[PDB]
Symmetry: D2
Subunit: 350 residues, 4 copies
């Protein structure tokens, strides 16, 4: 094959520097990019009307927590709406995030769509006009992006088509992002839905990630200028067999070691349906796993960082401090976890 | 694998019926889906302001040509704007087309975009919200669609990435169309640009089509409910070697016989940069080629059907009949050509 | 994206001419390339010792049938041993076959091997030194070759790996053959084992054939100089739902129309476990299917042509004529079937109605 | 999307343990699996008859070097003939190797064959009956195998077909080996022939390795029980532009970091046409490269370990010691190099890639 450089040494340096800042030691990502329709259920759980002002206030609550969170948060992912909102002091949210040492991220996908001829499988859309959108988001303060692909473990899934198609679209998205100085976070989420066991999740995860990286290679993606946001390897949500955190950690680390090139700057785990504590304990076990890990192993949590804060807030302005306190607590717990320093108080078998 | 029927028997019948109607014996397609920007150059060549009214009048001029074009035109591809315009008498253009026995088509792609890391190669965008658009277009009169992918022959092109990506996006577009009762015309155009010879075009065409059909299979596409719009196999525009129309025909038919499944309902050739007469003479030779052809071999011409008509019109309403006469003559010529009855006045070597 | 011609116009012409001769109108293939281990069970069924002489005698019985079979047989596939054996008159079997207007074929694969990490799936070996073997076989009379890949329909099969690997090895085999003037018969057999229905077999067959032709394209195979030997599309041998011959024909022709390029010279169906009569009736229905079929649709039968003959012989040299007559009868039936002109309504032994199905061990 | 375990935990443990022993800190591989026809050139350069006895004497010369090579040699690749020969004392060569702490390897491919429709490209044969051959070799003392695929950088190569086909055959070979307790060394050699520069080699190497590992994944290969034998990333032999060892090391390590999963136990570099000293300097530079390397980076040298020994020997029994001393010196040098501790004296912008 013949090379036709997609990026200059300068463009590579910019992307690599951004990627490294996000996952620097002890730092993780706050995923606060829920759309109106996705955060609707959260607000209704606390009897709070889903208005623009309430969403702005809640986001402000998280983004303006005290400096204790600064060394814990390397990046914050925002939804389009939030990227253009301002704190009470008039400061745009991207400025608020940057001022606390964090990198600003932006969700750019346009949701999943059904793959015809499959058993309920999907791919993700959002490539149309993505380059122009990225160029604008960059000018407006964003340095990295989010794009979520969803795969499911079932009797006949994920199918060959679902794997190939989702891997290909993630590569297209990544390619467009890098052309605009935006670090793409590649997110091939394999849902925990089902009664499958740990070994099954590990197998599927290994096959999906192998497909993802081959696609990234085919599309000339600069891995040093990317991050990976995969599901941890865990048994199905309804699996009858139970496992220890150490087992989940070994399965996860083994899967990654068998598929993720050392060149990838970092892995930022999604928490799925895990509770706040569960997500932190598992991430800690992952970092304590006695196998060599050539990439940062950290977090990109949404609910796992906001669950208690949202509840403490309750939609009441007078609970601002209490709510932010809960967020800080989880930010500190996960910052410790991504270093293997968190305390709540036979690899050949994989 | 396991079958999860993308289409029901009823949906298949609808698509197959539409596809067969468009390429019925003696019929072809008038490709009049030029956008404001793509038609600008041609309107300029005749010193005519590029306004919606002049565009409507020009399209009206073609769509309302006399009844002689009825048995020649099986389908008419329109640009979005035109699908919603009406003739002077108040009849919506789709109605005008149908009343003359033609099927209405709609361009649904959103143009080409550059593929990073390649030598000026592209893929095509337009998948976002495509399903909803197809459902709307279907309700508004369209029964088939157009989506153009572009490949170029050069020292290092078309590359593996370009072939794979364009084939994959064509399959996604095809799948979405069929879910909405729209027959997708798969258009993997290989540009005639360059000094390459006939055998090189044939080789590249064979490899591209093989990739296209494997992708359609992977995406569970119903071939009987599709049409193919490929380039004819010809030498590059700058090639110094000369060839007869019979050689062009043999190379073209051999390439198709080696890659296009019999199930494909029809092949509607694009004319590229060929003149009106050249496009007709070649299509005629293709249909007279001794080899067995299991699919209709017809036309989907834009410039090859409008060149003389546009010039005769010159933006002058008083030239209406003169302009239509030119279009009618090419429609008649190509109807004869797709039957191997048009007259202006060693196969192992492939 | 650059062409480096694998074959010259002359080489292409030779391959195309051979392929067309094999499937010329009314003609089919006699698959008599069974190995010693396979023919042994056949000879045992009739209390006949499995010796080289008995095997030679049996093949001679089929190859020397009267001239009525000449118009019916376009090609005969032989096992290595048989290619070098001679009839009682001293004539090498290849010469015997050729003198009757038939093309000589040779089995070149070395059997199936297990694909690790799969649920009992396999791929096929035999590429090592294949070029030299083909060159020698060509000199010794063979003009086409046989190579069998095997796939099975189940809950997890055929898997992505099984399909990809088998399609790739078939392509390598085809490439090497064409470099030596040998027409390769591409055989991706999907076993009838299981209780799946007609539509499931059709689905799998379509996916497998799509993979096969994409691989052939990737390996620069000259399709006009090849033949395809696929399973007919039918329900699983244990399927409860019953189907008519017309439905089997429609499903078969539809699957082929959706995957096999018109350039492929011909399709020579394997009979699987179908009885002699069933194989003839289905082949006939296929040729009568209303859909457009741009390739010859004929047969490449082994057991489906030999069942009655093997029984009539019984290992007794005295039953020579009797046995050959049964073979000639099936050859004539299939010759008419591959033309859509076969109509039973007559004297067809019960042996021709017996299921020739054998579970994959 | 369903797993059907190709290997049990015990089988995986055996393969992983073998792989790790071969590339343990400070150890590399002596590649002495040259066939009769291949070793013919070497013997003629020193005017020595190519007989089984001469080949045995030469192989014995390398295999029986003094104990100084023990901590340097983790594995020795033998040709079929040699696996069944014996030292003067009657000890089978596999026993001699094992007694010195080395693992015994065996070449199992049957050479390259031309890929029709390509510009002189090839694939490699040898899968037929490979399982039976592996079981027999395992029984006779071998624990790992060698299989060489060859690709070339040219105007239109390596082509898509060549890359896909060689990657697929390497996967089949690896799969069969692992079923028989044999650790397969995956060798996708990209020849240094041509005038291409360093970045072109790096590009091609990256694309080839990506295809190789995708194939291994598709074939369910246990990476921890495998080793990789790639070309170092270097400019073509006819390249007019010159590069330092640091640049060669950066390009090489960068290419590997972008394609080789950390699960792969080790990388054993082939030296190609590099001189003995050059091969050691580059390997040392590779190990000193300031980037994270999650796998052992060592050697699997043939000529780079035998060049001087062959010449010193000259086919004269009286030169045994002199010849063995040359081999020992290169074994020691490379042992230091695969630790980044090599020095001529003896025992004493990354974004632009």
């Amino acid at each position: 094959p013949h090379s036709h450089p997609a990026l200059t040494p300068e463009q590579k340096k910019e992307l690599s520097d951004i990627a490294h800042r996000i996952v620097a030691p002890g730092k993780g990502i706050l995923a606060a990019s829920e759309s109106t329709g996705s955060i609707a259920k959260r607000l209704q759980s606390i009897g709070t009307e889903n208005t623009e002002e309430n969403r702005r206030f809640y986001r402000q609550l998280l983004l303006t927590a005290d400096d204790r969170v600064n060394p814990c948060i390397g990046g914050v992912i925002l939804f389009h709406e939030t990227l253009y909102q301002k704190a009470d002091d008039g400061r745009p949210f991207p400025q608020v995030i940057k001022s606390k040492g964090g990198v600003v991220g932006i969700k750019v996908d346009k949701g999943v769509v059904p793959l015809a001829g499959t058993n309920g499988e999907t791919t993700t859309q959002g490539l149309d006009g993505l380059s122009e959108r990225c160029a604008q988001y960059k000018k407006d303060g964003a340095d990295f992006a989010k794009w979520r692909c969803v795969l499911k473990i079932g009797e006949h899934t994920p199918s060959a088509l679902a794997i190939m198609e989702n891997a290909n679209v993630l590569a297209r998205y990544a390619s467009i992002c890098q052309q605009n100085g935006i670090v793409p976070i590649v997110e091939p989420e394999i849902l925990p839905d089902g009664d499958h066991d740990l070994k099954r999740c590990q197998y599927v995860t290994e096959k999906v990630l192998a497909a993802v990286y081959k696609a990234l290679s085919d599309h000339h993606i600069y891995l040093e200028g990317t991050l990976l946001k995969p599901n941890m390897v865990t048994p199905g949500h309804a699996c009858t067999q139970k496992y220890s955190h150490e087992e989940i950690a070994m399965a996860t680390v083994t899967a990654l070691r068998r598929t993720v090139p050392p060149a990838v700057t970092g892995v930022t785990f999604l928490s799925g349906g895990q509770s706040e504590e569960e997500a932190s304990i598992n991430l800690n076990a992952i970092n304590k796993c006695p196998l060599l890990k050539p990439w940062a192993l950290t977090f990109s949590y949404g609910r796992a960082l906001q669950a208690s804060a949202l509840k403490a807030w309750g939609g009441k302005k007078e609970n601002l401090k209490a709510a932010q306190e809960e967020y800080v607590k989880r930010a500190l717990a996960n910052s410790l976890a991504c270093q293997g320093k968190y305390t709540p108080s036979s690899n050949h078998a994989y």
